[PDB]
Amino acid sequence: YDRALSIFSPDGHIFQVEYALEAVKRGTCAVGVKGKNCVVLGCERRSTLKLQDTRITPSKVSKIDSHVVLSFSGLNADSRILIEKARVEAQSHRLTLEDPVTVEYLTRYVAGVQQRYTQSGGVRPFGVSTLIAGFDPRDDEPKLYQTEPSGIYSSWSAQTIGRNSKTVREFLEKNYDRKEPPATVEECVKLTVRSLLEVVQTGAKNIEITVVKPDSDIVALSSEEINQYVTQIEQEK
Template sequence: MAASRAPSAWELSRQRRASRPPPSVIAQPDTGPQHSTTQDSELYLPDLLLYPVNFSPLATTLATGLVAEGIPHSNLFAVFSPDGHVFQVEYAMEAVKRGTCAVGVKGKDVVVLGCEKRSALKLQDTRITPSKIAMVDNHAVLAFAGLNADARILIDKARLEAQSHRLTVEDPVTIEYITKYIAGVQQRYTQSGGVRPFGISTLVVGFDPNDKTPRLYQTEPSGIYSAWKANAIGRSSKTVREFLERNHQEDMDREQTIQLTIKSLLEVVQTGAKNIEVAIMSPGKSIEMLPDDQIESYVKSIETEKQEEAAKKKTGRGGTTTAAILTRPGGGEGSESRE
């Protein structure tokens, strides 16, 4: 005797339709979109195609790929609004702007990543607190701003691709290659059904194999990637980027690059060294995380420099004011003694 076969979805759908009366064909007044009480988990694709009016507009849209009437475009995935926006991508970019700040700066033979980190809670175990800086391969590192959970998934995908490339080609990935891969993953999640875009931007840095030229790239939730000399992502990134534009110089050495990175972060970080982490990449070397005591010394040096500059400006303004008082129009210096 042949083994019994489980009924297919189409057969189950036919059995369900046979056990219920056919849909009414009497015209009904248009009262707006009607939502069915049937649970979406009980729906079959043939039911949606044959009797779409009996089910929710969202279920019809997800099953058929057609935008059902009554669903806001902001609630759909990978659908353009009438004015050409993909709102889910724009919402993902807003999530990036709400994330902590991350900065990348290239020097002559070094590239530095600096990130703002949130303060740990009193009972939190700081040993397993996720960092904003992650190593993709021995020569490639990225920092991110946005949702930590999204970053964890994207970093795992990038690491897997880097190891697969190493096993297949027997050569490490270039920084541009892994950046393209990360941007490609982000882009695919903007045009696929049933998923949402990654709510993160990344700064990818490192050195290509047998090359001493520092690399710095940025990726965005939309899938765009670009190369930079210095850049910032996350909250107040515009302010930090303007600071970098004013102070960045070509061919900076290691100390100057580290100092500029920390100084730019201090534009938005008000709590000092305890909320800053710094990673340094050099040719032929793995990632170097700057110890907290060294970050503290850099912060103290920068604050002392700022105080000295403020004192000089104050002294200069004071001398100018005194000279203006002693020198008056028509009388010259010492005119007050002749009054």
């Protein structure tokens, strides 16, 4: 094939990018807040449909390395195409220059993939938007980036993407303070959980939280831990 499927618009755009942005909104919702020493990406997980497994059904947040986690919102099918490249580039980094990836670098590469599919003949661009997070190796500053279909990436102190991202981000302007992150890791879990129960609702059976602490600690919380934070917050409120 060789025909353009991305073409210039008489306005100033490409219609496939605006369209792709519309695609991220019709997806499920992932939230990002970083603490003083943690990233937390939590995601809304479906359960309209029932008899769905929990062990074998893939999660919304897929560990690339031992220190770089990626979450995605938009088409759940497409997602796996951006991640397959992203994992192999991380092993190539280890090979050719040594040291594992820096979060800034992986975000720039992932951006370059979506960038390319906005301008190469015979592709549409990805309808999928990432929160790519993690730690730099031998450092402990939390890093939280979000890249989007344009092929543009932005760093964010806290961010949210997917359905009702404007509604959630409004919440986060009013409770997360740029100057003083949540004082500990635990305060940071209560913030991501506090945000989700606005839009997601319908029990703690939908809320997923992955927490990363520096020095290669990836833990994904159990349904019991989630219930516990939702309950506290419901009651206090």
